Amino acid sequence: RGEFIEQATTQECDFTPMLTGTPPPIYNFKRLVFTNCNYNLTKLLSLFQVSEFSCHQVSPSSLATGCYSSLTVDYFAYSTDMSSYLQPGSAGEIVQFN
Amino acid sequence: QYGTDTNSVCPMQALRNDTSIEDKLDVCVEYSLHGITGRGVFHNCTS
Amino acid sequence: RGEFIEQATTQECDFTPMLTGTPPPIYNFKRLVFTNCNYNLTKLLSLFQVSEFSCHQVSPSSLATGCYSSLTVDYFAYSTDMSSYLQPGSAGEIVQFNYKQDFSNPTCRVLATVPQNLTTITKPSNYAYLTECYKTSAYGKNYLYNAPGGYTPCLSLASRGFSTKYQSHSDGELTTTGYIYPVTGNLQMAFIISVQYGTDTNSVCPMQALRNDTSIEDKLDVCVEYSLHGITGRGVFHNCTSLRNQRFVYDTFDNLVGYHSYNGNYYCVRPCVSVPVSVIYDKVSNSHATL
Amino acid sequence: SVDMGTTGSGNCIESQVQPDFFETARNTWPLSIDTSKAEGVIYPNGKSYSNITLTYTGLYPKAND
Amino acid sequence: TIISQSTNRPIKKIYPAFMLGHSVGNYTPTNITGRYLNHTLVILPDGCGTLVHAFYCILQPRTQAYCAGASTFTSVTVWDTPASDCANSQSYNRLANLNAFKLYFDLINCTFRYNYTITEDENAEWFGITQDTQGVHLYSSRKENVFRNNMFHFATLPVYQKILYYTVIPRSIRSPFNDRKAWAAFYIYKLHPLT
Amino acid sequence: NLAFNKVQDAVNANAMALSKLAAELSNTFGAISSSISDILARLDPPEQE
Ligand SMILES: *[C@@H]1O[C@H](CO)[C@@H](O[C@@H]2O[C@H](CO)[C@@H](O[C@@H]3O[C@H](CO[C@H]4O[C@H](CO)[C@@H](O)[C@H](O)[C@@H]4O)[C@@H](O)[C@H](O[C@H]4O[C@H](CO)[C@@H](O)[C@H](O)[C@@H]4O)[C@@H]3O)[C@H](O)[C@H]2NC(C)=O)[C@H](O)[C@H]1NC(C)=O
Ligand SMILES: *[C@@H]1O[C@H](CO[C@@H]2O[C@@H](C)[C@@H](O)[C@@H](O)[C@@H]2O)[C@@H](O[C@@H]2O[C@H](CO)[C@@H](O[C@@H]3O[C@H](CO)[C@@H](O)[C@H](O)[C@@H]3O)[C@H](O)[C@H]2NC(C)=O)[C@H](O)[C@H]1NC(C)=O
Ligand SMILES: *[C@@H]1O[C@H](CO)[C@@H](O[C@@H]2O[C@H](CO)[C@@H](O[C@@H]3O[C@H](CO)[C@@H](O)[C@H](O)[C@@H]3O)[C@H](O)[C@H]2NC(C)=O)[C@H](O)[C@H]1NC(C)=O
Ligand SMILES: *[C@@H]1O[C@H](CO)[C@@H](O[C@@H]2O[C@H](CO)[C@@H](O[C@@H]3O[C@H](CO)[C@@H](O)[C@H](O)[C@@H]3O)[C@H](O)[C@H]2NC(C)=O)[C@H](O)[C@H]1NC(C)=O
Ligand SMILES: *[C@@H]1O[C@H](CO)[C@@H](O[C@@H]2O[C@H](CO)[C@@H](O)[C@H](O)[C@H]2NC(C)=O)[C@H](O)[C@H]1NC(C)=O
Ligand SMILES: *[C@@H]1O[C@H](CO)[C@@H](O[C@@H]2O[C@H](CO)[C@@H](O)[C@H](O)[C@H]2NC(C)=O)[C@H](O)[C@H]1NC(C)=O
Ligand SMILES: *[C@@H]1O[C@H](CO)[C@@H](O[C@@H]2O[C@H](CO)[C@@H](O)[C@H](O)[C@H]2NC(C)=O)[C@H](O)[C@H]1NC(C)=O
Ligand SMILES: *[C@@H]1O[C@H](CO)[C@@H](O[C@@H]2O[C@H](CO)[C@@H](O)[C@H](O)[C@H]2NC(C)=O)[C@H](O)[C@H]1NC(C)=O
Ligand SMILES: *[C@@H]1O[C@H](CO)[C@@H](O[C@@H]2O[C@H](CO)[C@@H](O)[C@H](O)[C@H]2NC(C)=O)[C@H](O)[C@H]1NC(C)=O
Ligand SMILES: CCCCC/C=C/C/C=C/CCCCCCCC(=O)O
Ligand SMILES: CCCCC/C=C/C/C=C/CCCCCCCC(=O)O
Ligand SMILES: *[C@@H]1O[C@H](CO)[C@@H](O)[C@H](O)[C@H]1NC(C)=O
Ligand SMILES: [Zn+2]
Ligand SMILES: [Zn+2]
Ligand SMILES: [Zn+2]
Numbered sequence: 001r002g003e004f005i006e007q008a009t010t011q012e013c014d015f016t017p018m019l020t021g022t023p024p025p026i027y028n029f030k031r032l033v034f035t036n037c038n039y040n041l042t043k044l045l046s047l048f049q050v051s052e053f054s055c056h057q058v059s060p061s062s063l064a065t066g067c068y069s070s071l072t073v074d075y076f077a078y079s080t081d082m083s084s085y086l087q088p089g090s091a092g093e094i095v096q097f098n
Numbered sequence: 099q100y101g102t103d104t105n106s107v108c109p110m111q112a113l114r115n116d117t118s119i120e121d122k123l124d125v126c127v128e129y130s131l132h133g134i135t136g137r138g139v140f141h142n143c144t145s
Numbered sequence: 146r147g148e149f150i151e152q153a154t155t156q157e158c159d160f161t162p163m164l165t166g167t168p169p170p171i172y173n174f175k176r177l178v179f180t181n182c183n184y185n186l187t188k189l190l191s192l193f194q195v196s197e198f199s200c201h202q203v204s205p206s207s208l209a210t211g212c213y214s215s216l217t218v219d220y221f222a223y224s225t226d227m228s229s230y231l232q233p234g235s236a237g238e239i240v241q242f243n244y245k246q247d248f249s250n251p252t253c254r255v256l257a258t259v260p261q262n263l264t265t266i267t268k269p270s271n272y273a274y275l276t277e278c279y280k281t282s283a284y285g286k287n288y289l290y291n292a293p294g295g296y297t298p299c300l301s302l303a304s305r306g307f308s309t310k311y312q313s314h315s316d317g318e319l320t321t322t323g324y325i326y327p328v329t330g331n332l333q334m335a336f337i338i339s340v341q342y343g344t345d346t347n348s349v350c351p352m353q354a355l356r357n358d359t360s361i362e363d364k365l366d367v368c369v370e371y372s373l374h375g376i377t378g379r380g381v382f383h384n385c386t387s388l389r390n391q392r393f394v395y396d397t398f399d400n401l402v403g404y405h406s407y408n409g410n411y412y413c414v415r416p417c418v419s420v421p422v423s424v425i426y427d428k429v430s431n432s433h434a435t436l
Numbered sequence: 437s438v439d440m441g442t443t444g445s446g447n448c449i450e451s452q453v454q455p456d457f458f459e460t461a462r463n464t465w466p467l468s469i470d471t472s473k474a475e476g477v478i479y480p481n482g483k484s485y486s487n488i489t490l491t492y493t494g495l496y497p498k499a500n501d
Numbered sequence: 502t503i504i505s506q507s508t509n510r511p512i513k514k515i516y517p518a519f520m521l522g523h524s525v526g527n528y529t530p531t532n533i534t535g536r537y538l539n540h541t542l543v544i545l546p547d548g549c550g551t552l553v554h555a556f557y558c559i560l561q562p563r564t565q566a567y568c569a570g571a572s573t574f575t576s577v578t579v580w581d582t583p584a585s586d587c588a589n590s591q592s593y594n595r596l597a598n599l600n601a602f603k604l605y606f607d608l609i610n611c612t613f614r615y616n617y618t619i620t621e622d623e624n625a626e627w628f629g630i631t632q633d634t635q636g637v638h639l640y641s642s643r644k645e646n647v648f649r650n651n652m653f654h655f656a657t658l659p660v661y662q663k664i665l666y667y668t669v670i671p672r673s674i675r676s677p678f679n680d681r682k683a684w685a686a687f688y689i690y691k692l693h694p695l696t
Numbered sequence: 697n698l699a700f701n702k703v704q705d706a707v708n709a710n711a712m713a714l715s716k717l718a719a720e721l722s723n724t725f726g727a728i729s730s731s732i733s734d735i736l737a738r739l740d741p742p743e744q745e
Contacts, residue, residue: 001137002127005116010106036106038113045236050229057728059234059740066737067108067133069101100734128733136733176661178635201742214482215635234740247634248742293741294634296662301524301539339634344483389484389645397488438614440556441596444603448567451578451673457503467688476690478629478640479651495631495692 013037026098029076105133147369150358158182167267171243172275174221181348193257203251212350212375214343223335242275247293252339259332268332271325278321347375368417385413469501502683515684516546518670525666530572548595549587558611569605627652
């Protein structure tokens with residue numbers, strides 16, 4: 001089997017707000033929405049030391065090789081030792097109020 | 099989100115223009131057109 | 146229900162290469178394959194401090210009490226804090242260029258820490274892994290990715306060694322880059338275990354499952370649980386008189402119907418409920434009979 | 437490093453390379469794969485089967501190769 | 502007989518030999534292709550058709566005359582002497598081909614060394630080889646019944662690097678002028694993923 | 697005419713069988729997608745099965 005790929009040319013997605021300044025608290029999280037742009041995921045992921053990831057109906061590897069209609073990212077400052085309080089179904093105050 | 103129409107948010111590693119469909123007309127190929135993927139055979143048609 | 150266990154006697158599996166010397170880097174992992182031998186899993190696991198395990202289509206407890214046709218183990222030095230990069234579906238460089246776990250067979254992923262008292266294992270100087278492996282092309286970098294369970298194409302280039310961070314080696318068309326960082330504290334390792342189950346005899350069994358409770362002569366007329374050369378089930382054995390050098394007889398529908406035992410007898414194998422039973426009932430007299 | 441025996445000492449015997457004498461038309465004896473006789477078929481591992489027809493996907497030679 | 506187009510002799514069965522490796526290059530002195538680099542898997546029959554060798558070591562060429570490291574090198578050919586090696590079934594020389602092979606190369610850092618006993622006969626047979634994660638697998642029709650053409654697994658070799666190339670080792674029998682026998686040809690068919 | 701109506705009923709039944717057969721290929725049946733290619737592109741082998 002051969003190959004056939006057609007893609008339009010777009011500009012670069014702006015990730016500078018997330019990579020500059022002080023990240024906000026969890027209750028005041030920052031949201032970014034990207035449409036009609038391209039991103040260099042390798043550059044972004046190299047800047048960080050990942051401790052854990054959990055995906056639903058998708059895989060991180062697929063997010064580096066597939067196209068989508070929209071990309072939304074919410075980010076905030078958070079201590080890793082409180083990871084359990086962000087898990088689906090948690091009964092803590094993080095899910096209730098943050 | 100995945101849209102049935104064109105998907106305009108793509109990584110740079112997937113940015114390519116290997117549109118050599120003219121030479122690959124009579125062959126089963128894997129196509130990736132604006133976020134739409136699959137397998138099929140392309141036949142010259144008028145529309 | 147009774148018991149019926151028949152197992153052959155084999156030698157001990159050789160785990161000495163894994164327990165001696167310096168474990169290799171992730172991109173140069175060592176592979177061991179065991180067939181027709183027995184192992185003492187309790188002794189092996191006691192030597193290590195397990196931090197996490199993840200199994201697919203199998204459980205660690207079952208791996209200590211069951212027989213298999215083959216046992217494959219891949220091991221290498223790996224820091225525990227990079228555990229997320231070994232997870233299925235990761236987008237990091239570890240899966241792309243160092244090691245991709247295969248899921249075509251039941252498998253387990255184990256991370257463990259080597260204790261100080263285990264002096265037979267020697268610490269390496271640094272942890273190492275490859276960051277990229279590509280071929281030069283007109284368009285740009287043509288990356289080469291690891292197949293599941295295979296080695297990286299840049300293995301020969303990586304053998305030259307890395308002395309500094311982001312050091313690159315090239316031999317023309319191929320180019321690779323490596324990353325190193327010192328080992329602090331106790332050594333940490335990784336273990337990728339895979340097993341296969343065969344319809345024939347399974348010659349790889351733990352020592353805890355090595356028994357010869359072949360008292361089938363006294364347990365003929367009773368439903369029993371049998372474990373014969375890795376084949377398990379429930380049934381009733383009937384004395385019978387009876388293709389090739391095989392101890393198991395199967396019907397067209399893959400039902401176990403006949404067995405050849407160590408004693409020399411041949412037994413018919415039937416499920417614990419096999420005899421048809423019908424009841425003739427009369428409502429007027431409230432009487433019943435059996436056919 | 438397993439023991440591979442005594443190291444060789446001496447000279448190697450000369451050989452003459454004449455491919456014309458081996459790949460000529462007179463020494464052509466073709467023999468194709470006959471699927472009716474199941475030539476070149478590797479028996480499946482583990483278990484045997486008797487009086488049955490099964491479909492397998494594995495490594496097999498092409499018919500009439 | 503290939504050496505003499507006139508004489509005709511009854512055909513006898515002969516076993517092949519192979520070298521399998523992961524990378525190939527040139528023989529440096531003569532610039533002749535077909536040199537296996539790093540660890541190489543070698544399968545060699547011996548014992549006048551009663552033994553087969555299998556080892557995985559680095560081949561280091563020797564600079565003696567007509568050997569791999571010399572300028573008079575033409576091919577890697579293994580030979581045997583039927584008068585001495587195959588005089589009788591009781592005094593078969595089991596290391597004749599191995600000794601001949603050691604003259605071309607020095608064997609360095611061999612991981613393993615295996616051998617298998619073959620019963621002498623004149624029946625036709627089949628031989629196969631594959632590779633997967635577990636290692637390199639050998640198949641033969643002499644395992645269960647030599648009068649059926651089905652091949653059965655009999656060995657597994659601990660070679661885990663992916664094998665990309667193989668080369669047939671030519672053989673030449675130094676038979677006396679009296680016998681000058683003829684040898685049966687063998688055919689190689691490639692396997693494919695098929696239903 | 698009832699007898700004339702039964703002819704159209706038979707034709708409609710013949711059409712309905714093929715309509716039922718064709719429409720079932722567009723259902724996801726609870727999966728992330730109705731296309732095998734999308735499943736292979738968006739997921740990894742442990743979760744594709
Ligand atoms: C079929 O394959 C098998 C297995 O590979 C071969 O068996 C080996 O044969 C070699 C000789 O070719 C043996 O090597 C010799 O072993 C002697 C004793 O070795 C002890 O230690 C080893 C390792 O633990 C044990 O396996 C073994 O049982 C003994 O306990 C040594 O004394 C020999 O050294 C002397 O000879 C060599 C010759 O090269 C000299 O270099 C030395 O200086 C010294 O003079 C030698 O190493 C080997 O041990 C055998 N292994 C086994 C497991 O049996 C068969 O030979 C082979 N059959 C064939 C080819 O026909
Ligand atoms: C080459 O020749 C040998 C020798 O066989 C003899 O010479 C042939 C020219 C024929 O005339 C043969 O009939 C004659 O015996 C062949 O080996 C022999 O093959 C036959 C084929 O059936 C074997 O017969 C079998 O023998 C066993 C013995 O237990 C029975 O179980 C079987 O039912 C069957 O009869 C015979 O034993 C075998 N002999 C030896 C010593 O191995 C050989 O096959 C032939 N090769 C080819 C490629 O044609
Ligand atoms: C995504 O981002 C990464 C990181 O910014 C890009 O990789 C980088 O690409 C540049 C330009 O090709 C490389 O610079 C060159 O590096 C070599 C190193 O020897 C040097 O000789 C050259 O003069 C030049 O500076 C850079 O090394 C490289 N970095 C890494 C870590 O690979 C990448 O190209 C981006 N991807 C896309 C698709 O745009
Ligand atoms: C699997 O390996 C373990 C560990 O090597 C084996 O257990 C050990 O078995 C030995 C021999 O039976 C025990 O030694 C004895 O210990 C007592 C302790 O009081 C002492 O009195 C005796 O003189 C003797 O040395 C050893 O303690 C025991 N260790 C542990 C941790 O239980 C085990 O037997 C092996 N399993 C199989 C199936 O072979
Ligand atoms: C692939 O090729 C197409 C067709 O040439 C490119 O589409 C053109 O893009 C340029 C800007 O790069 C526009 O000025 C043209 O109008 C576009 N043409 C059409 C017909 O739409 C497309 O950008 C290329 N994609 C790549 C290089 O990723
Ligand atoms: C269970 O008993 C059988 C039957 O006695 C054992 O099989 C024998 O094993 C010995 C070596 O231990 C061989 O010499 C015999 O030839 C074997 N006999 C047969 C009929 O195969 C078997 O090893 C025992 N299994 C155990 C003790 O785990
Ligand atoms: C192995 O030897 C062959 C020749 O036997 C080499 O091919 C030569 O390559 C040079 C350099 O590009 C050319 O000038 C010659 O014309 C080539 N000769 C032939 C006959 O094609 C080959 O490069 C060598 N390979 C290695 C890896 O050294
Ligand atoms: C496999 O063999 C090749 C060629 O003999 C070796 O490649 C050489 O490696 C040395 C040491 O790193 C380099 O300095 C040479 O330039 C290489 N030569 C060539 C011709 O490529 C390689 O080392 C061997 N592989 C291993 C794992 O030892
Ligand atoms: C065969 O293996 C030996 C032992 O592992 C290797 O010898 C080592 O070679 C390295 C690299 O040159 C030296 O620094 C070591 O000191 C050697 N060790 C010993 C104990 O001699 C040898 O390189 C290998 N031979 C090959 C790959 O051809
Ligand atoms: C450590 C608390 C121990 C609780 C002991 C007794 C509890 C009685 C009932 C408790 C409900 C379950 C609470 C589980 C909370 C998990 C953490 C979280 O999701 O936030
Ligand atoms: C910490 C990085 C934060 C990324 C912020 C924005 C990302 C835009 C899209 C990203 C694709 C998902 C990457 C998930 C990587 C998980 C870790 C791994 O599997 O290697
Ligand atoms: C082999 O090739 C080299 C060039 O790489 C050349 O110098 C040498 O003479 C050649 N040797 C022979 C025997 O042709
Ligand atoms: Zn067409
Ligand atoms: Zn009964
Ligand atoms: Zn095998």
